[PDB]
Amino acid sequence: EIVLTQSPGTLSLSPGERATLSCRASQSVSSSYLAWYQQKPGQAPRLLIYGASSRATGIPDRFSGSGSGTDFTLTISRLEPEDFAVYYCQQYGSSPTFGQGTKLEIKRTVAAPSVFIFPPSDEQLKSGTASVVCLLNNFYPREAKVQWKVDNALQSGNSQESVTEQDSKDSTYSLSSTLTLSKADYEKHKVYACEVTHQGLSSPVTKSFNRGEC
Amino acid sequence: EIVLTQSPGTLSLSPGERATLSCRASQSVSSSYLAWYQQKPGQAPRLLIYGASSRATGIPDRFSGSGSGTDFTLTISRLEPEDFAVYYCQQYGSSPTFGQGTKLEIKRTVAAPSVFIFPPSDEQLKSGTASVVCLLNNFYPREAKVQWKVDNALQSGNSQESVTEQDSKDSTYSLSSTLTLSKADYEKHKVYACEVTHQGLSSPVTKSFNRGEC
Amino acid sequence: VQLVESGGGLVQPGGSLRLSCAASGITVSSNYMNWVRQAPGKGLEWVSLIYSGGSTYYADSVKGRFTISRDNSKNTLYLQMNSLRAEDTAVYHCARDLVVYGMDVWGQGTTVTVSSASTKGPSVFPLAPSGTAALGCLVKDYFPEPVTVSWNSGALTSGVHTFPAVLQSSGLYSLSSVVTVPSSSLGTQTYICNVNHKPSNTKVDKKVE
Amino acid sequence: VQLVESGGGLVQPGGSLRLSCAASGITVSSNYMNWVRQAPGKGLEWVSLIYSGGSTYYADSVKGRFTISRDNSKNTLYLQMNSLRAEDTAVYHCARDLVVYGMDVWGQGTTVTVSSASTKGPSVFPLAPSGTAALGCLVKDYFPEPVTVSWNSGALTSGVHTFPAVLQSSGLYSLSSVVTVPSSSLGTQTYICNVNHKPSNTKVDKKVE
CATH class of the missing domain: 2.60.40.10 (Immunoglobulins)
Known part of the structure; x- marks a missing residue:
């Protein structure tokens, strides 16, 4: 079966910077089935990328997919506040399979507890x-x-x-x-x-x- | 598939006489899956015979099954009043199929309309x-x-x-x-x-x- | 030990409905279970098989339009029916299959009617005569079944015949109810049929003379 | 364009439940429809697919316990869950798959919980103190979810931390809620946490000192 490993487990960056998310499949994979989703706490996911590089309607220009074969990359050019959430990738052979998920996180001053x-x-x-x-x-x-x-x-x-x-x-x-x-x-x-x-x-x-x- | 052909469509006999209902299968068939059912007007069917010659419990001696191969016969040795109903036969390969049904009614005089x-x-x-x-x-x-x-x-x-x-x-x-x-x-x-x-x-x-x- | 069906009613062509079968005496999760229907005046027709191991089997007449399922905590079998047609009009039974030992427990069943008609009321017309005389009542054009026809509010029963309804080309039902009496009593005894059709809240009492 | 999930609730281990997914904006019978659940704090797990043509597919973790069905005129997708286990505790979504175009329509979902657990009551214990100081309230042994924790009946909010509940070995939830206040204001201000567990009809105001 198909298995999708998202790297990293959690990405830590500040607004304005560029996030580079990684989805990895276990075998060679078609580029027409690999969707990217965005999920904000307590809400259903949002479709961001479909195929491998196509923005769903209403998805702004900061979001961009890429890659093929086994390595695919969602990239967000200039991060905004509403873009801090969790992002899953899909692939679909006989049936759907998801990745475990990648979390965006706001990098701050190293502060003691x-x-x-x-x-x-x-x-x-x-x-x-x-x-x-x-x-x-x-x-x-x-x-x-x-x-x-x-x-x-x-x-x-x-x-x-x-x-x-x-x-x-x-x-x-x-x-x-x-x-x-x-x-x-x-x-x-x-x-x-x-x-x-x-x-x-x-x-x-x-x-x-x-x-x-x- | 299996197709079942009951004969005759309408069998007329007086109380006491012996009833011979016929069920015909379109091809060779195992005697281990062939059942007979009784349906009185407005009642759910009643299992009478299963396998090919085995009385289901509660069914009197007067009922008795037989047959093998492609022809099988339900036999009511001595008819009674409550035996005047419709009788169906079942066979079963990948899934059940039934017969068209034989109506068994009272045979009376020749009264004119x-x-x-x-x-x-x-x-x-x-x-x-x-x-x-x-x-x-x-x-x-x-x-x-x-x-x-x-x-x-x-x-x-x-x-x-x-x-x-x-x-x-x-x-x-x-x-x-x-x-x-x-x-x-x-x-x-x-x-x-x-x-x-x-x-x-x-x-x-x-x-x-x-x-x-x- | 029982099998009690529910859910059956009236549906238009193209609609849907789901039939319930609440069991007591056998557990549905542990049995082959079947759905077998009976069209009016017709024979029995197998429809849906379900293994105790979830595997399912349907007859070619309803493949892709019916779905059989169950619910163990509630001990109830379900039959889902989509894209219904007029031919699907029938009484539906749920029964336990013992494969080799036949089907030994049945349910009395629920009535399902598919048509594009409404639920109208019947007109009652008389059937008048001119050594026994004949007169009757015609209960024509009504949907859905049934109606109840008595004579003289139940007093006159000896010699009464109420017929099975026929489904006219219009999609509406129609039957006749008669009674045969001695000819001389035509001028002495008054004859009134009693027609009640609960679906339409219509009750009619018509004098035959 | 919506997908509205119903049916979710609490089920004992080994019991059965059926979930509903009410749709508008898409017609369910024409679409690929998917059930996808999310356990607390986990990821997305695909559960059940159903073709426009009625072909079904299931993930191995639910094969034999779950049945996926629909209903054309009611435009409602269903999911029958049988022989439920503790793992199946999750939030359950229905979505419209476009295969290549991914799943473009989702529902907020309905929450499913499985446990031979009872209801009990959340015992509220104080977290008393002895530059800055810290006091709190330990909400322990309540089940199922959830509880609301406020402070000073809502007045004090600055510096409050309500932790997400953890599920103890007993099958019982438990969380803490704390607040940091200036160390001086210990003798002058009264601090009472306000706890409410609506399932067990339980509201508590505990004073921390």
Whole structure:
């Protein structure tokens, strides 16, 4: 079957510049079936390119397809604000197949995060489960690492993360890493730390608390 | 494909006697897919025989199947009143196909019809259409002929027939024939004859009227 | 153990409709299932087969216009019909196929009527006589079926014959209902047929004299 | 020119549901029509194709569980989902394929969720603090989607961060909502998060201190 690998996983550029998106097929592929689509959050996709180089009606002049065989390239000459979204490529043999997707992202000043750690609320410690939340407020770039340490012991597989959409005001990100533990296993240690590693920090910041200490 | 040919189309026998319904297949056929069904007037079919000679549960001993190759026969050893219905046969290759159906009705005496003819009402002659009705009441067997003579002109393609189900009390049928003409074509002629022909009549009886004579 | 059909009604030529078949006693997802129709006064006609493994089979008369499907959580078989024609007018059954053991469970079925007609009411004209006398009523030009014709509001039944409707060239139905009485009673007993056609909210009571 | 999807909702694992796609501006029976779903935070996955001529094609992940149908006069494309699983939880779109000219018309879609989950209630725990300070509210163990989190009944908006929900091992969602305020205003301003989960008839105002 046909498989379409889009590169890169996410492209990071500022307005006015030129984006060069890459769609890659697994075998030689016709240039008449390879459509490009644009999808903005919470909306259906928009057809941008069809065939391989043709603008759908109502698609302005900044958008342009190219390529053939196995490598095809959507290119946007001069980026505008409304062009930051996700872009998929189509190919169609016996049936349609899509690519995984490429994200556009606003490059900004390399900004350090704001690192906070919270202990479990006393209410939740009655229910029998402890959630230890670590907040990283407004950093850039999106790429960071949260490492939970419990009594000088690396924590693995018991945390979960989530991130917000690139903020429309200061074009930065925010992350929430939740460590979940049983009340019994919580009461078995003392030092809970969250050591963050980001490009805006000269050395890894570590916020921490000690259990049961006002 | 497979095509099934039941014979006879209409089998007439009295209660008690033995019924031999025939089903004919257009080509060689496996005895393992051939079923018989019973349909009483206004009821969904009932599975009677499956495979070729196997009674479905709830079906009495009086029913019994047989046959192989291209000819098969359903056999009702001793008829009963509730066995007077239509009987279909099934065969099946890539998909099911059925037969045309055999009607099994009561065989009674040779009772002669009683003929009546009706002119179009004055109310309809205001509408602009003339329906002339001829009635044949309580007769057996079902096989009869109705002929319209308008001024001794045998009328063709302008009449219709319908017949009641064999009556539950005396095992007799009844037929209705309607001659639809226009008010102008009706008033062009005088004698509207309906000449009936049946086995209970030594010679055909005609009932007729003269248009506009009280 | 039951098979109950729904969805059947009136549709114009070129329209569509979907027939429901709610099952209890057998699970549709685990059976060969069939759709078999019966045109008026005609024999049975297989239409749609569906394997328990999703594979489907249709007769050449409805290929490309019908679609058979099911719904396991609800335990209901469906038959979708598109681009309907007049010939498709029939009563439709859903039945379980055991292939080698025949079809052992049927549903009473639903009635489907395709025509480009409307839903009008019938006119009642009389049929008057001149050793038994004959008189009757003509219920002509009405769509759709049925109508109900009694005599004397149900008192007169001995000797009554109401006929099967005929579908005229106009696309409208028409039938006749008669009764045979002793000739002498023509001047003593009053004869009135009773015609009701629920589709058109029409009820008529006509005196034959 | 529109494609309007209906039918989406919650289904237990192993149950069945049918989705609708109402059209205007294109006539469905003449077009290639496609069903394409999108799981939360995933990409586009092609699901079901249907030719103008009725030929069907399915992706291997749904072959045997999904049926694609239409209906000419109702101009509505359908998708029958059977034996649903957890993976099929997604937003489901219908689109008009022009093959070479790609898919030029799409619908905003209807959301499908699959889970033996129940409904419970979102427990709201405080995220209390002890240059700038941070406080928040942990909304934990509610299902299904979604919840609305405001602060000071809408007054405080500057610096608020409502995180997208994560789905825990129990089959239960959970998210956090935080706000950064000046470190001094801790003793003077009252901070209460406002949480509302309409499915479970649950609204909470928790004070963080």
